[PDB]
Design an enzyme around this catalytic site. Structure first.
Site, short mmCIF file in Angstrom:
data_model
loop_
_atom_site.label_atom_id
_atom_site.label_comp_id
_atom_site.label_asym_id
_atom_site.label_seq_id
_atom_site.Cartn_x
_atom_site.Cartn_y
_atom_site.Cartn_z
N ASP A 21 0.79 -1.23 0.00
CA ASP A 21 0.00 0.00 0.00
C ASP A 21 0.81 1.27 0.00
OD1 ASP A 21 0.76 0.19 2.59
OD2 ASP A 21 -1.19 -0.60 3.44
N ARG A 76 0.91 6.78 0.25
CA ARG A 76 0.16 5.71 0.93
C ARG A 76 -1.25 5.70 0.33
NH1 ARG A 76 -2.85 2.49 3.22
NH2 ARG A 76 -2.59 1.68 5.34
N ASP A 114 -5.76 -1.24 3.66
CA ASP A 114 -4.60 -1.67 4.47
C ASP A 114 -4.14 -3.03 3.93
OD1 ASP A 114 -2.79 -1.52 6.70
OD2 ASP A 114 -4.12 -2.71 7.95
N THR A 115 -2.91 -3.11 3.47
CA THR A 115 -2.32 -4.38 3.15
C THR A 115 -1.53 -4.89 4.33
OG1 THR A 115 -0.47 -3.16 2.09
CG2 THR A 115 -2.21 -3.97 0.58
N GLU A 129 1.71 -6.18 6.33
CA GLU A 129 3.10 -5.78 6.22
C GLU A 129 3.86 -6.94 5.60
OE1 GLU A 129 4.21 -2.61 7.28
OE2 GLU A 129 2.14 -2.17 7.73
N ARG A 175 3.63 11.38 4.08
CA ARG A 175 3.25 10.58 2.91
C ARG A 175 2.06 11.24 2.23
NH1 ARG A 175 2.54 4.61 5.61
NH2 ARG A 175 0.90 5.86 6.59
C1 LIG Z 1 -4.24 5.43 5.05
C2 LIG Z 1 -4.03 6.50 6.12
C3 LIG Z 1 -3.09 6.28 7.09
N1 LIG Z 1 -2.91 7.24 8.07
C4 LIG Z 1 -2.01 7.01 9.27
C5 LIG Z 1 -2.86 6.24 10.33
C6 LIG Z 1 -1.91 5.24 11.03
O1 LIG Z 1 -1.21 5.98 12.08
P1 LIG Z 1 -0.28 5.05 13.04
O2 LIG Z 1 1.07 4.83 12.38
O3 LIG Z 1 -0.04 5.94 14.33
O4 LIG Z 1 -0.87 3.60 13.32
C7 LIG Z 1 -0.91 4.95 9.89
C8 LIG Z 1 -1.13 3.59 9.22
O5 LIG Z 1 -0.41 3.53 7.98
P2 LIG Z 1 0.26 2.12 7.72
O6 LIG Z 1 -0.83 1.07 7.55
O7 LIG Z 1 1.10 2.37 6.41
O8 LIG Z 1 1.23 1.62 8.88
O9 LIG Z 1 -1.07 6.00 8.93
C9 LIG Z 1 -3.57 8.44 7.99
O10 LIG Z 1 -3.45 9.31 8.91
N2 LIG Z 1 -4.48 8.73 7.03
C10 LIG Z 1 -4.69 7.76 6.05
O11 LIG Z 1 -5.55 8.01 5.23
CA LIG Z 2 -0.18 -1.54 5.89
#
Ligand SMILES: Cc1cn([C@H]2C[C@H](OP(=O)(O)O)[C@@H](COP(=O)(O)O)O2)c(=O)[nH]c1=O
Ligand SMILES: [Ca+2]
Length: 129
Positions: free
Chosen positions: A15, A29, A34-35, A37, A75
């Site tokens: 993702d 991103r 959510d994919t 890891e 991102r």
């Molecule tokens: C997809 C997405 C992720 N995020 C943030 C939420 C999660 O915060 P946390 O890192 O504190 O868990 C994290 C998850 O992305 P990842 O799934 O790439 O790890 O990215 C956003 O804020 N907005 C979004 O639209």
């Molecule tokens: Ca992920």
């Protein structure tokens, strides 16, 4: 919403990918998904699916939603298209991502994506198997 140009710099995982957007490198991103890891079940399969899709594309485009365009990690948050096919949707349709991270104001394609997930779940594909 509207599609804008980008070019692949490097695939990263299911993702996220590094893209050049308005001439600057950025990690993107994928919105609303959510994919797993890489180190988790289906993670390698997700990574490979997204890598094939973005690497084989003649044209990559990004589409921002109506809300935040970057997350707290810097991102870009977008829907990504590979020769006009949405990567976010295609991952979910194959059972390689769940619909997830649905924040108000950045959820334009939520129902499209939930319909794909329902289809993947009925077929017991991958994550749903
Ligand atoms: C997809 C997405 C992720 N995020 C943030 C939420 C999660 O915060 P946390 O890192 O504190 O868990 C994290 C998850 O992305 P990842 O799934 O790439 O790890 O990215 C956003 O804020 N907005 C979004 O639209
Ligand atoms: Ca992920």
């Amino acid at each position: 919403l509207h599609k804008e140009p980008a070019t692949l710099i490097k695939a990263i995982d299911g993702d996220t990918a590094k893209l050049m957007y308005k001439g600057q490198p950025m990690t993107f991103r994928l919105l609303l998904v959510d994919t797993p890891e890489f180190n988790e079940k289906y993670g390698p399969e997700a990574s490979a699916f997204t890598k094939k899709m973005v690497e084989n594309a003649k044209k990559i485009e990004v589409e921002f939603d109506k809300g935040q365009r970057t997350d707290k990690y810097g991102r870009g948050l977008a829907y990504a298209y590979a020769d006009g096919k949405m990567v976010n949707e295609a991952l979910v349709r194959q059972g390689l991502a769940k619909v997830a991270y649905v924040y108000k104001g950045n959820n334009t394609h939520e129902q499209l994506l939930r319909k794909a997930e329902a289809q993947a779940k009925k077929e017991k594909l991958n994550i749903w198997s």
